């Protein structure tokens, strides 16, 4: 008998695909796959306590060293519990593969008239049909490996994202002759550099050469394309300033002479003035999302031509009313072509941007990222200043992941990163409870390495249960929890709208959180507190020195403002242009800051 | 100048619909609805810490007192987080309504070529298309209330289920002349009792009058139809023994002289023998799911005719190869129709079933629910024996919810209930982490009332965050946690399949759980531990006496068997036989099985 169990061929296929880690929860629907994978000993199965955490962990796992991980979900609630993680990978263009079990294949077909399949199954492929790149239900044993190979390829192809492969129970346990396995062969990669795309590169170079105040907007699509190592030669060979999106912060040293921060709705004052006063904007590998460009294209860089580079055609033209050259090309290939034309013997002459570069620096001097607006309040540490202090304790290869809330905003508006350091979170979907699972994925991607997790009192609750996963594997995760009596981010929203008592956002309005230090002791986790500046530096040094997991509660003002921020101002109400962040600077100052004078909307504020 | 905010109209609608509780989490996508509901003060918003818990709590909220609740979710992950709750209410035919916000309506159209809508939005309606009864996105302000009234009616009509109404932000904050508000008029309620169905009731009454060994199988569909009070007079009038489905345990007093327990793959030995030796089976409001009838229809009640009553046409005929009368009718309407024909003048004479009833009681004397197979394993408390002991501490108005695992299996195989007591869980989907959200639903339904939650160390983790919601509202939830070093249910599964070391099921194999008494202290929750019989009664009396939340860890053997269980029997050379439904493991001696089966035992059981 030359037949082999399908589950064992699946485990073999995982090793040949380089998948060394799998996150998930066991159940009757995937018990065969757990056994075959565990007995083969190549892929380590990380058991979590909510499938949601499994489909989030696989994202930051890949982002760390570029190796895809698998989420291993069982029938029914095992598959539904993973859907949030699938969407956040879909929204952030992060490749991963879900392997979901299900009832016996005799029940699994859409035409089944009953509400549910078999005992507790459903059509998991239909549920993620609009939030994944590919879904398939293996119905023939001989195709199980075919679909896993295809599932992985489509996840990494083009615009990356999650794929969903469902293998019914009886397909896992069947037996076939290994020579009857079908294998998927990937088609040749597309050659983006066509004559058309070449003429677009030539147009960009022309504009770059002539532009007096250029600004490059660089995004995580460059890293997904594997070209972030070309950014230093490119910036210095152009001499042009550069902004980085929140997702692409770690692609360049925040202290590089030509990198001037991050702009947007929660941008940095210095970075917004840089973008809004430019005469040419080249977006590479950045989605130009609403939090990046505001709420009106006619107010975005009103003196500048805007070109875009993006591997997704639909994302590349979504601003075609405002943009000029919409380049559908891989970010790396595009940067190589642009460098190839800069290094050519017949390269055009690049006019000097020295005055512009000098004006950008002046912007950063007039508007420091942590400024007078961030003063401490009434017996509390200002979360922005704490981030500046905490920044001084990063290790040379530090990795930081954040949840939403204070950690997300204070983090991305302040923290600086060097080469070798990483910054990760989920911004496409922006879901609470992404922090802890994000740390798991990084830690396992670096052989149970260290990860700093900037979290919040609210977001900690969504996936609280993953503290047990953390202690179980003794993961060196340094977990900072910003306590502020509930949903501080929503507090500011409902106050701006209604200017009345809080509703469902603090302890008095129905939302409370536990004492996370008492909780840490229950999990055998060493806990600390930071309430003032006296014990700060000594506390930070001890947290960073621990070998295992640590919790460190950071208490802030229950109503601290998030600023700078592009908010609505009451003149009637007005939505100011991108440059006029709140709290509002004096008009005469803004007038001098704007090359062509302030926007009509600002004059009356 | 004479316009009202749409959100304020929605808040007004919820009061007119009698929705007094709404579970959810706030966010940009539904901040206007939170405001408007709270200002009006009619509907209490309960804030949970994972949207999944809001979509589970609305379920057991309804089943308690028959009042629907809302789930209030927000854009993006606020909606995706609730899907699991939607699917369990879909699988258990439990009504409820989800009101989910979303990005501005100019982004929310399926033709949008981008991966996501606006900032963080998606088509929340498409994602639940196949696991909910109705989904609609409100795109005109004037129909916002129309779709809520429609959603609540569709959730409650026919076979109840969840409905999903999505309202973009800008629709919530919009303002309209209230005169322009459209309202939903429900179509006329169907008349199930047509001449064709009336003829099927006659056929059933003919079979019941003639049958010598009849068995009624009563399910939660009866409760959902509002006809549970008709059961006691029906069984007594017919003199027919009756079984109850796991979900419908609390419809009849378990000690009623004609109620003989629960059958299935995890059924009681006596219940299975009663089912498999009958000559007529009348199933009313029960789905006859795989865990109830086994894996072969041809092996189910091999001496009986089987009739089925169910309001879902698709469920009523799914066993049509084997069943005879497939009656598509509301359960209460059917029972009322059968009671009218029973009490009529021309009602046929009901042949005596006294001998069958006696044989049903001999079965229960021969096979008690807690028997020798439930012996304490080597210095531990057997969960089945703990459930029997725990049963005697139930209050008169006790409500018991369970999670999966030991709480589910040992609870539904041992626990007995009387009128006034309720038993709830999620059996359709069978998701871990249902216990705590369930106890919230019941507690708020009964105005912060007391609830006993039978939970497990593994299942406690899926929604551990809801211990905070329990403390924040001082809900008198009595939380029992069965500790057994991980996923005991799965240990048996992989052991029967692979007969090797555990994988992903206990601490040694990658799955551990915290000390829940030490967490309890962290949440300011009193906690007890029951490791042996010696201190057991004194603890249980303490737990029941508490006025606020309490935790009690119950320690069992990390490899205790779950029995009786219809399970596979394996052989040395790789052979395995799936025995018939009556032949539950651990297998009883063949000579005793032969005498218990009327036509002798099944061929499969002879060589076992
Ligand atoms: C409350 C909030 C506030 C925010 N504020 C800001 C802010 O002030 N400033 C800011 O910059 N961001 C901000 N963000 C984040 C921002 O809105 C986006 O979520 C994202 O982080 C922008 O960075 P990105 O374009 O690199 O990421 P992504 O949105 O993931 O962009 C990746 C893009 O690259 C493309 N791509 C993928 N692979 C390739 C490839 N191989 N070749 C070429 N292109 C490829 C993708 O198609 C996509 O268009 C905020 C988010 C939130 C939730
Ligand atoms: C591991 C496991 C083991 C189990 N073991 C057993 C076991 O041994 N024995 C057992 O009995 N159960 C068992 N169950 C539960 C069983 O499989 C079902 O999930 C269910 O609990 C059986 O009860 P029910 O048919 O009343 O519930 P449901 O499945 O909810 O049945 C409701 C039915 O009534 C219909 N209905 C709804 N409203 C109306 C109305 N107004 N009028 C008429 N009909 C209506 C519905 O369409 C549906 O068909 C087990 C579950 C699990 C997860
Ligand atoms: C799962 C889930 N539920 C709700 C939300 C909505 N939501 C937010 C956003 C970013 O999505 C938003 O509305 O802008 S922000 C937010 C509050 C976060 O509170 P935390 O205590 O975690 O952080 P702080 O705001 O720093 O106190 C919530 C509930 C969300 N993002 N994810
Ligand atoms: C969310 C989720 N994830 C996985 C499962 C699978 N699953 C079960 C079933 C019932 O679905 C099954 O497969 O039969 S049972 C089960 C183990 C539950 O372990 P617990 O420690 O809670 O209970 P005991 O088994 O009594 O120890 C798991 C993981 C599940 N039910 N729900
Ligand atoms: Mg908070
Ligand atoms: Mg367990």
Scored b (16 or more CB within 10 A) or e, B361-392 reads eebbeebebbeebbebeeebbbbbbbbbbbbe
**Are A378 and A508 within one domain?**
yes
Q: What is the dihedral of CA B275, B276, B282, B287, to 10 degrees?
A: 80
Alpha helices in B486-557 (DSSP H): 488-498, 516-522, 536-545
DSSP state of B373: G
Residue nearest to atom 31 of ligand 4 (CA): B431
Report yes or no: A21 and A444 within 8 Å, Cβ to Cβ.
Answer: yes
| Residue A133, min C-alpha distance to chain B (Å) | 10
Residues A433, A296 share a domain: no
Q: List, in sequence order, every residue forming a beta bridge with A597; answer none if it has no partner.
A: none
CA distance B365 to B120: 62
Measured in degrees and rounded to the nearest 5, phi and psi for residue A98 equal -100, 135
Contacts of B477 (CB under 8 A, 6+ apart): B436, B439, B440, B443, B450, B451, B452, B453, B470, B549, B550
Pairwise CA distance, residues A210 & A222, whole Å: 24
Q: How far apart are CA B472 and CA B46, in angstroms?
A: 10
Q: Are B88 and B56 in contact, with CB atoms under 8 Å apart?
A: yes
Q: Are residues B381 and B297 in the same domain?
A: no
Selecting from A129, A291, A493 the residue whose C-beta is nearest the C-beta of B119 gives A291
Query: Looking up tokens 């040293």, which residue turns up?
Result: A253
Of B31, B52, B509, the CB nearest to A490: B31
What six digits make up the tokens of B136? Answer: 């609609």
CA distances A17 to A34, A39, A146, A149, B279, Å, are 17, 17, 12, 7, 57
Chain A residue with Cα closest to B288: A119
Alpha helices in A211-318 (DSSP H): 221-224, 231-238, 269-276, 290-293, 313-316
Q: How far is CA A79 from CA A170, A355, B89, B100, in A?
A: 17, 56, 16, 21
Q: Which two tokens stand for residue A461?
A: 């609750």
3-state secondary structure A394-418: CCCCCEEEECCCHHHHHHHHHCCCC
Say how many Å lie between the first and final Cα of chain B, rounded: 83
CA pseudo-torsion sign A582, A587, A591, A593: negative
Q: How many helices (H) and strands (E) does chain B have?
A: 25, 21
Closest CA to B309 of B288, B326, B290: B326
> Are B460 and B406 in contact, with CB atoms under 8 Å apart?
no
Cα nearest neighbour of B508 on chain A:
A472
- The answer to whether residue A185 sits within a structural domain is no
Same domain for B158 and B25: yes
- Cα atoms in the Cβ-side hemisphere of radius 13 Å centred on A30: 32
Evaluate whether B141 touches B6 at the Cβ level (below 8 Å).
Answer: yes
Tokens encoding A22 = 């799998």
Is residue B60 included in any domain, yes or no?
yes
* Ligand showing the shortest atom-to-Cα distance for residue A155: 1
Residues B389 and B361 in one domain: no
* Closest residue by CA, ligand 2 atom 29: B287
The two most distant CA atoms of chain A are separated, in Å, by 86
Environment class of B275 (CB within 10 Å of its CB; exposed 0-12, middle 13-18, buried 19+):
buried
Nearest to A257 by CA among A157, A361, A109: A361
Interface test with A, best of B51, B85, B503, B507 (most A CBs within 10 A): B503
Give the span between the Cα atoms of A491 and B87, in whole angstroms. Answer: 32
**Last residue of some domain: A366, A383, A416?**
A366
**How far is Cα A18 from Cα A597, in angstroms, rounded to an integer?**
56
For A480, the token pair is: 């900072």
Cα(A80) to centroid(ligand 3), Å: 22
- The H or E element containing residue A218 is strand A214-218
Contact A603, A594 (CB under 8 A): no
B561 inside domain: no
Q: Which chain A residue shows the shortest CA-CA distance from B161? A: A115
Binary contact (B115, A35; C-beta < 8 A) = no
- Would you state the structure tokens that stand for residue B592, as one six-digit string? 């005793």
- Which residues' Cβ are closer than 6 Å to ligand 3? A 404-406, 430-432, 456-459, 462, 482, 484, 487-490; B 25-28, 74, 77-78, 81
Which range marks the domain in which residue B283 is found?
A: 195-366
Grouping H, G, I as helix, E, B as strand and the rest as coil, residue A326 is strand
Task: Label each residue of A104-128 as H, E or C.
Answer: CCCCCCCCCCCCCECCCECCHHHHC
Q: How many CB atoms lie within 10 A of CB B71?
A: 31
State if residue B92 touches ligand 2 by the CB under 6 angstroms criterion: yes
For B121, nearest residue in chain A (alpha carbons): A429
d(CA A351, CA B447): 75
Torsion, Cα of B375, B381, B386, B390 (10° steps)? 150
User: Residue A407: CB partners within 8 Å, gap ≥ 6?
Assistant: A435, A454, A455, A456, A459, A480, A482
Mutate to test the pocket of ligand 2, among B60, B225, B264 (most ligand atoms within 8 A of CB): B264
Cis ω for the linkage preceding A263 (within 30 of 0):
no
- Name the token pair of B214: 């009849």
For residue A4, give both structure tokens: 């082999």
Can you say whether residue B383 is alpha, beta or left, with left for phi > 0 and alpha for psi between -120 and 50 degrees?
Answer: alpha
Cα B285 to Cα A599, B253, B334, distances in angstroms: 69, 17, 10
Residue A189 lies in a domain: no
Asked if residue B172 has its Cβ within 6 Å of ligand 2, the reply is no
- 3-state DSSP call for residue B427? coil
Among protein residues, the one whose CA lies closest to atom 31 of ligand 3? A431
Shortest CA distance from B517: residue in chain A: A522
Number of neighbours of residue B205 by Cβ within 10 angstroms: 19
Q: B507-539 burial, b if ≥16 CB within 10 A, otherwise e?
A: eebbbbbbbbbebbbbbebebbbbeeeeebeee
C-alpha torsion sign, points A200, A202, A203, A204: positive
SS3 A491: helix
Token pair in block for residue A324? 């000029």
Q: Give a three-class secondary structure readout of A130-167.
A: CCCCEEEECCCHHHHHHHHHHHHHHHHCCCCCEEEEEE
Instruction: Identify whether residues B151 and B244 lie together within a single domain.
Output: no
Option in A46, A87, A122 nearest B131 (CB): A122
Task: Choose the residue to mutate in A88, A200, A218, A247 for probing ligand 1, maximizing ligand atoms within 8 Å of C-beta.
Answer: A247
Helix axes A51-65, A435-445, angle to 10 degrees: 50
Domain assignment present for A55: yes
Tell me the best of B266, B269, B429 to mutate to test the pocket of ligand 2, counting ligand atoms within 8 Å of each CB and taking the most.
B266
Number of neighbouring beta carbons within 10 Å of residue A146:
18
State the nearest Cα–Cα gap between A460 and chain B, in angstroms. 9
Neighbours of A519 (CB within 10 A): 25
- E-strand stretches of B144-210: 162-168, 175-176
Convert B29-91 into a string of H (helix), E (strand) and C (coil): HHHHHHHHHHHHCCCEEEECCCHHHHHHHHHHHHHHHCCCCEEEECCCHHHHCCHHHHHHHHH
Distance B27 CA to ligand 3 centre (A): 6
What whole-number distance in Å separates Cα of residue A487 and Cα of residue A513?
10
* CATH number, domain containing residue B541: 3.40.50.970
How far apart (Å, rounded) are the C-alpha atoms in residues A15 and A452?
A: 30
Rounded Cα–Cα distance for residues B288 and B245 (Å): 9
Strand partners, B577: B569
Structural contact between residues A469 and A46, judged by C-beta atoms closer than 8 angstroms: yes
Asked if B40 and B10 touch (Cβ cutoff 8 Å), the reply is no
Q: Are both A223 and A250 inside the same structural domain?
A: yes
Q: Considering only alpha carbons, which residue of chain A is nearest residue B497? A: A32
Tokens read off for A215:
């600004």
Last residue of a domain, one of B366, B386, B404: B366
Q: Which of B80, B461, B504 comes nearest A87 by C-beta?
A: B80
What is the phi-psi region of residue B122: left when phi exceeds 0, alpha when psi lies from -120 to 50, beta otherwise? beta
Sheet containing B44-47, strands listed edge to edge, beginning at the edge strand earlier in sequence: B44-47, B21-24, B70-73, B96-102, B162-168, B134-137
Q: What angle do CA A418, A424, A426 make, to 5 degrees?
A: 155
Cα separation, B452 vs B435, whole angstroms: 10
Give me the helix-helix angle, B83-91 and B51-65, nearest 10°.
30
Buried b (16+ CB within 10 A) or exposed e, A118-131: bbbbbbbbbbbbeb
A158 C-beta closer than 6 A to ligand 1: no
Degrees to nearest 5, angle at CA A137 with A134 and A140: 130
Q: Looking at the domain assignment, is residue B205 inside a domain? A: yes
Q: How far apart are CA A104 and CA B583, in angstroms?
A: 23
Region of B163 (left: φ > 0; alpha: ψ -120 to 50; beta: rest) is beta
Boundary residue ending a domain (A150, A180, A210)? A180
Tell me which residue has tokens 């503290």.
Answer: A467
Alpha-carbon gap, residue B443 to B477, rounded angstroms: 8
Residues composing chain A: 605
Cα–Cα distance for residue pair A552/B494, rounded to 1 Å: 40
Report helix, strand or coil for A590. helix
Facing residues of B307 across strands? B282
Of A77, A274, A267, A58, the C-alpha closest to A163 is A58
Q: Is A316 exposed, middle or buried (0-12, 13-18, 19+ CB in 10 A)?
A: buried
Strand partners, A290: none
Query: Three-state SS string across A498-538, please?
Result: HCCCCCCCCHHHCCCCCCHHHHHHHCCCCEEEECCCCCHHH
- Let me know: does B530 contact B379? Beta carbons within 8 Å: no
Structural tokens at position A252: 């360049």
Measured CA distances, B121 to A86, A422, B105, B115, B514 (Å): 14, 27, 11, 9, 36
**Obtained via which technique?**
X-ray
Tell me how far apart the alpha carbons of residues B213 and B353 are, in angstroms, rounded to a whole number: 7
Residues 6+ apart with CB under 8 A from A94: A59, A62, A63, A88, A160, A161, A162, A224
E strand map for A230-379: 242-244, 280-284, 305-309, 326-327
CB of B87 closer than 6 angstroms to any ligand 4 atom: no
Q: Residue A210 burial by CB count (10 A; 0-12/13-18/19+): exposed, middle or buried?
A: middle
**Closest C-alpha to B155, from B97, B221, B73, B224:** B97
| CATH number of the domain residue B359 falls in | 3.40.50.1220
* A127 contact residues in B (CB cutoff 8 A): 83, 127-128, 130-131
CA distances to A172, A182, A364, A496 from A383, rounded to whole Å, are 51, 55, 20, 21
Burial class (CB in 10 A: 0-12, 13-18, 19+), B113: exposed
Cβ pair B318:A505 closer than 8 A? no
Give the residue from A35, A54, A115, A518 with the most B CB atoms within 10 Å of its CB, the best one to mutate: A115
Q: Give domain status of residue B188, yes or no.
A: no
Both B450 and B515 in one domain: the answer is yes
DSSP type of residue A77: H
State whether residue A349 is helix, strand or coil: coil
- Rounded Cα distance between B249 and B311, Å, is 20
Of residues B247, B251, B246, the one with CA closest to residue B231: B251
CA of A89 to the centre of ligand 4 (A): 26
Provide the terminal-to-terminal Cα distance of chain A, rounded to the nearest Å.
83
| Tally of helices (H runs) and strands (E runs) in chain A | 26, 21
Nearest to B127 among A91, A127, A430 (CB): A127
Residue of A nearest to B125 (CA): A127
Residue B337 pairs with which residues in a beta bridge? none
Residue carrying structure tokens 């109404």: B165
Of all protein residues, the one whose alpha carbon is nearest to atom 1 of ligand 1 is: A291
Task: Enter the resolution in angstroms.
Answer: 2.7
Q: What is the DSSP string of B288-329?
A: --HHHH-S-GGGSSTTSEEEEEES-HHHHTTTTTT-S-EEES
What does the angle CA A107 – CA A112 – CA A116 come to, to the nearest 5 degrees?
70
Residues B401 and B462 in one domain: yes
Token code pair at residue A458:
């609210």
Residues A356 and A386 in one domain: no
Decide: A177 and A316 in contact? Cβ < 8 Å: no
Q: What is the dihedral of CA A322, A325, A331, A335, to 10 degrees?
A: -130
Question: How far apart, in whole angstroms, are the C-alpha atoms of residue B16 and residue B149?
Answer: 10
- Among B522, B523, B566, the residue to mutate for chain A (most A Cβ within 10 A): B522
State which ligand 2 atom lies nearest to the alpha carbon of B266: 8
Cα separation, B471 vs A593, in Å, equals 53
Q: Cβ distance B581 to B566 under 8 Å?
A: yes
Task: Report the C-alpha gap between A522 and B477 in whole angstroms.
Answer: 21
Report yes or no: A15 and A42 within 8 Å, Cβ to Cβ.
yes
Token pair recorded at residue A545 = 């020195």
Burial track A73-96 (b if 16+ CB lie within 10 A, e otherwise)? bbbbbbbbbbbbbbbbbbbbbbbb
Other beta carbons less than 10 A from residue A228's beta carbon? 21
Bond prior to A32 in cis (omega within 30° of 0)? no
| A304 within domain boundaries | yes
From A91, A467, A494, residue closest to B31, measured CB to CB: A494
Q: In whole angstroms, give the CA distance from residue A219 to residue B547.
A: 56
From residue A150, give the alpha-carbon distance in Å to each of A131, A436, B581: 17, 30, 42
Decide if A26 and B504 are in contact by the 8 Å CB cutoff: yes
Q: Are residues B156 and B201 in the same domain?
A: no
**How many folded domains does chain B comprise?**
4
Distance separating alpha carbons of residues A23 and B509, to the nearest angstrom: 14
Residue where the block lists tokens 């005879």: B324
* Test the A interface: residue of B27, B43, B77, B90 with most A CBs within 10 Å: B77
- State the smallest CA–CA distance between residue B287 and chain A in angstroms: 11
Residue B549, Ramachandran bin (φ over 0: left; ψ between -120 and 50: alpha; else beta):
beta
DSSP 8-state code for residue B210:
H
Tell which atom from ligand 4 comes closest to the C-alpha of B409: 26
Across the interface, which of A34, A83, A431 has its CB nearest the CB of B83? A83
**Residue A220 near residue A244, CB atoms below 8 Å:** no
Q: Does residue B279 sit in the same domain as residue B391?
A: no
């Amino acid at each position: 008998d030359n037949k082999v169990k399908v589950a064992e061929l699946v485990a073999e296929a995982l090793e040949n695909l380089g998948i060394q880690h799998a996150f998930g929860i066991i159940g009757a629907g995937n018990v065969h796959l757990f056994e075959a994978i565990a007995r083969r000993g190549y892929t380590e199965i990380v058991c979590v306590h909510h499938e949601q955490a499994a489909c989030m962990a696989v994202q930051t796992y890949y982002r760390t060293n570029g190796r895809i991980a698998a989420a291993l979900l069982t029938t029914g609630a095992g598959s539904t519990n993973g859907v949030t993680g699938v969407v956040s990978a879909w929204a952030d263009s992060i490749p991963c593969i879900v392997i979901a079990g299900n009832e016996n294949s005799k029940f699994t077909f859409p035409e089944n008239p009953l509400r549910m399949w078999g005992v507790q199954g459903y059509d998991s492929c239909q549920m993620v049909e609009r939030v994944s790149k590919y879904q398939m239900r293996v119905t023939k044993m001989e195709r199980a490996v075919y679909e896993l190979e295809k599932g992985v390829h489509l996840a990494l192809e083009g615009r990356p994202g999650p794929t969903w492969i469902e293998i019914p129970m009886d397909i896992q346990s069947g037996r076939i002759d290994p020579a009857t396995l079908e294998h998927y062969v990937a088609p040749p990669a597309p050659d983006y550099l066509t004559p058309a795309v070449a003429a677009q590169v030539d147009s960009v170079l022309a504009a770059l050469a002539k532009a007096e105040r250029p600004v490059l907007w660089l995004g995580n699509g460059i890293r997904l394309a594997g070209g972030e190592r070309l950014l230093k030669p490119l910036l210095e060979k152009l001499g042009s300033p550069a902004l980085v999106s929140w997702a692409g912060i770690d692609m360049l040293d925040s202290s590089h002479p030509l990198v001037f921060g991050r702009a947007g709705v929660y941008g940095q004052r210095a970075a917004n003035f840089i973008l809004q006063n430019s005469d040419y904007v080249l977006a590479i590998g950045t989605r130009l999302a609403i939090p990046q460009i505001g709420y009106d294209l006619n107010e975005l860089a009103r003196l500048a031509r805007i070109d875009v580079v993006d591997i997704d055609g639909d994302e590349a033209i979504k601003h075609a009313k405002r943009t000029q050259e919409n380049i559908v090309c891989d970010a790396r290939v595009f940067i190589e072509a642009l460098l190839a034309r800069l290094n050519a013997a017949d390269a055009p002459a690049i006019a000097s941007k020295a005055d512009w570069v000098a004006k950008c620096r002046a912007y950063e001097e007039q508007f420091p990222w942590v400024g007078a607006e961030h003063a401490d309040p009434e017996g509390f540490i200002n979360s922005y200043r704490f981030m500046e202090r905490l920044n001084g304790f990063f290790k040379d290869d530090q990795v930081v992941v954040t949840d939403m809330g204070t950690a997300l905003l204070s983090g991305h508006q302040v923290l600086r990163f060097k080469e070798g350091q990483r910054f990760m979170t989920s911004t496409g979907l922006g879901e609470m409870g992404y922090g802890l699972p994000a740390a798991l994925g990084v830690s396992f991607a670096n052989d149970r390495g260290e990860v700093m997790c900037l979290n919040c009192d609210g977001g900690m609750m969504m996936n609280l249960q993953e503290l047990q996963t953390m202690v179980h594997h003794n993961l060196p995760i340094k977990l900072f929890i910003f306590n502020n009596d509930g949903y501080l981010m929503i507090k500011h929203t409902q106050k701006s709208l209604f200017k009345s008592d809080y509703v469902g956002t603090d302890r008095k309005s129905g939302v409370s959180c536990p004492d996370f230090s008492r909780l840490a002791a229950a999990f055998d986790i060493p806990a600390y507190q930071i309430r003032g500046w006296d014990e700060c530096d000594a506390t930070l040094a001890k947290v960073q020195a621990h070998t295992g997991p640590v919790i460190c509660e950071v208490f802030m003002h229950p109503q601290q403002l998030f600023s700078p921020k592009l908010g609505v101002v009451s003149r009637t109400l007005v939505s100011p242009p991108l440059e006029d962040l709140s709290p509002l600077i004096p008009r005469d100052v803004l007038e001098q800051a704007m090359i062509g004078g302030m926007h009509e909307k600002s004059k009356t504020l």
